Structure formats: C-alpha cells, structure tokens
Ligand binder design. Sequence first.
Ligand SMILES: OB(O)c1ccc(/C=C/c2cc(O)cc(O)c2)c(Cl)c1
Ligand SMILES: OB(O)c1ccc(/C=C/c2cc(O)cc(O)c2)c(Cl)c1
Lengths: 116, 116, 116, 116
Amino acid sequence: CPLMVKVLDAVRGSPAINVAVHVFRKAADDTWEPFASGKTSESGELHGLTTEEEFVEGIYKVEIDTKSYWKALGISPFHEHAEVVFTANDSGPRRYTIAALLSPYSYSTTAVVTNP
Amino acid sequence: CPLMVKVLDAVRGSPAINVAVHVFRKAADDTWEPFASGKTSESGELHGLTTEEEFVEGIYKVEIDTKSYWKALGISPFHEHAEVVFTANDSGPRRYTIAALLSPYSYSTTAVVTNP
Amino acid sequence: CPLMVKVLDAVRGSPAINVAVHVFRKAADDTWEPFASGKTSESGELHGLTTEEEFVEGIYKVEIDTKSYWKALGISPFHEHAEVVFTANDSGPRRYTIAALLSPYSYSTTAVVTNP
Amino acid sequence: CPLMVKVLDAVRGSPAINVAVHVFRKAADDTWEPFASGKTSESGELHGLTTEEEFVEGIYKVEIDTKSYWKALGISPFHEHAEVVFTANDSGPRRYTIAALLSPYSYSTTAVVTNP
Ligand SMILES: OB(O)c1ccc(/C=C/c2cc(O)cc(O)c2)c(Cl)c1
Ligand SMILES: OB(O)c1ccc(/C=C/c2cc(O)cc(O)c2)c(Cl)c1
C-alpha cells in the first residue's frame, strides 16, 4: 500500500496493538474530509488504508488515538492523540510509512518516504 | 508561567529560534479558538503565553510552524507543522512545559508537568 | 533471527543504509568481547547477526556507527556513535529488534522484545 | 557551565530526579578515565560538572544510570544505562547541554550547542 502506519510502545517494549487510526484529507473548502481509518495489528502495523488510485496529491492528517490506547492499560496519558500532518505526492507518487513511538507523556513520529 | 513552550533543532544541535507558535483551546461547539501565540526566543523558548487564572482546565492545542523553520534553512520539510493536543487538568498546583525536538522528517515531543 | 537492528534517517526520511553495526558481549572477566558485526541493508535493516544457539543469556552492547554514516553525507555530527546496552534472555529466550532514529545532533533508540 | 546534563521522564512527565550521571574522557591509551559525576537535581539537571579550562577538546562519554532510576519506580527497565559519546570541539566559544528523555524500553538524546 502507498500509506502504512506503524506504532510502537516504549513502556512495554512491544508493538502498539489495536491502536485506532484516522486519516483526513484537506478539501477544497479547507475543511478536513475523512479519508480512511483502521486499527493496528498484532505487529503494530496498519495496512490497506488506501490505494494508489485513491491516494492523490493533497494535504493529509494522520491522527493516532494514543489516549484510548493508554487508558486501556490504566495509564492517564498527557496527550489526546498524536497528529501527523503532511503534503503527499506533490513530487510524484511515493510510498509513506508513518511511524510513532509512544510513552504516556511523550511521543516521537517519523516518516519513511520511498519511491518505487 | 503555567505554560511554556520550548523548541529545539536536532539537525544543527541548537535552540529553534524565531519559530511561530500558536495555542488554541477547544470551545463548547468543539471549535479551535485562538488562545495565545508568539515566536520562540534566542533560547528557543516562549514564555508569558498565559496566566494561572486564564489557563483553566480544557483541551489545548499547541501548533508549531516547523515548515517555515526548515524552509528558512533550505531543507525540504516533511510536516506542515507540529501539533500537540492535551488536556490541562487541575489535580493540584501544576506548571506545563511543552518541549519539541525537530528534524526535517521527524519530531518528538514531551510534557514536563511539575508542582511549583 | 533473535537479534535484528533497524536504522532510520530523520533528515532524509529514509532507511539508514550501509550503517556499520558492532555487537559486544560482556565476558566473565568483565571486558567487552566482540560478538557479531554487520551493515544495514537497503531497507535500513541488519539481519543474521546471530543464532538462537549462540545468543545466550548475557549483557550485550550494540554499537551503531552513526558518525561514519553522517560524514559520508557531508554532515559533521555530534556523536561518535549510538550505543545500546542491555541484558538479554535472562527471562527465557526472546527476539530483539533494536531500532534507531538518527539526526546529526540527536538520536532515539527503542527496543521491541517479543516472545515466540 | 560548558557542560550541563538534563534528564527527563517520559512516563511520569517529569524531571528525572536523583539520577546518577558519570562523565568519562578517553585517554591516550584510549581508556575511559573518570572525569566528573553527580546526581541530577529536583529539576533533573546536573551543573558544575567541569570548567571551561578543564573541559578541553577530546572524546567524552556521559553515562546515565537509567536502570536504577526505573527500578526505584518498579518498572522493569530494558537498558543497563544510557550512554552518550561525543567529541568536544573548540570551534569558537561553546557550551554543551546533553539532554536525555527516558522510557523503560527507549531513550532519546539531543545536544544543544550554543555560543555564549
Ligand atoms: O519493520 B520493523 O521491524 C520496524 C521496527 C521499528 C521501527 C521504528 C521506528 C521509530 C520511530 C520513532 O519515532 C523513534 C524510533 O526510535 C523508532 C520501524 Cl518503522 C519498523
Ligand atoms: O530547561 B528546560 O525548560 C528544558 C526542557 C526540555 C528539554 C528537552 C526536551 C527533549 C524533548 C524530546 O522530545 C527529546 C529529547 O531528547 C529532549 C530541555 Cl533540553 C530543556
């Protein structure tokens, strides 16, 4: 797929499983249109959010529901969620992996952008 | 200073200087109302955004114009901006420092929540 | 394999390719014995460092040559290398992924520990 | 203060208090000679490690006893310690802050290098 999301847990040393993820795309009217959604697998990965034909040039926001994830482990986390906003495919079609590493009061995110 | 924002540059190994920073607070209609903003100092810090009386419980968003920072340095930046969304809670006397460490394709953020 | 190393580049938004990696194991005499070595592939991954029979209980140090990596891109980085030191398999045999995310003046590392 | 060390807790969202910190300097025989050490304050900071005259160019190692920190909080910590290895260079008047952000299975570190 042209878009994949990977989530890691820095407290447990494991993939972040069952993490809800929502993708929005900025519409012409400048509002965030819902584009795709899903949940991470046993390996902390989310595959199949979209296809090459559907994943056109645009501004995208990937929202990772970190709060729900931590609450289900008894932790009262700082953030509501992690948000990643970026322009996609404005220099031709590429493959995007959005990775996040999660702690209760901190997170980091990076992007791996590759051209097939 | 119940809220401070500090921004660092992981490429140059320096404070992120003259970075635009916006704080929004979610309203009743769940809209993002502008709350405070400014530009980071020579120390990469932004103080005096708000006061203890004005900084009530609620949901807050800190938005960092990372795109403009990297452009001014001539790196092609991946993110449109860096966004940090959290709930301010009154559980005792608290002060919040929102730190962000910036790279062209990644950022990390942490909250340092302390009792004065 | 029971030990894999993954390295990402936060400046370029890509896997960190051709990164030299050395693994040491603390010997009885309390010196660091050379245990395994290798280089990351096109995907930023290093496979085949060791086997289940060889990867016994111990204290291990994984040294990632970050300086050589950046120098070959014209960057004069802060760190000599990234070092990850940890006790392995003292609670039974497990699989270890050591991940690093690299910037010129910063890096982060995490561990994904799974039980097959 | 040409060298400061600051340590933060990504789980509790707080300064890492009373953390042991050791600084070593590589000798001619390429041995790690003890150079300075101490314990972080209530602010997670360690000042007065050295002086401008004593802090000559060379290779330095900052070692943080993260294992003992997490044990005191009852989390099973992955790393034996966190280590940061860098070359101090005289290219102009410089001051170094070595920051580390700690999780049980991960840490990130950055250098803030500034001209007084
Ligand atoms: O295919 B795999 O086995 C795999 C393993 C680990 C990662 C980790 C990515 C990462 C993101 C951060 O913000 C900080 C950090 O230290 C690591 C990834 Cl993308 C893939
Ligand atoms: O004195 B202060 O007000 C202060 C507060 C916070 C930091 C450091 C923040 C930091 C954040 C990350 O997401 C990764 C990382 O390695 C470091 C520093 Cl240096 C200083």
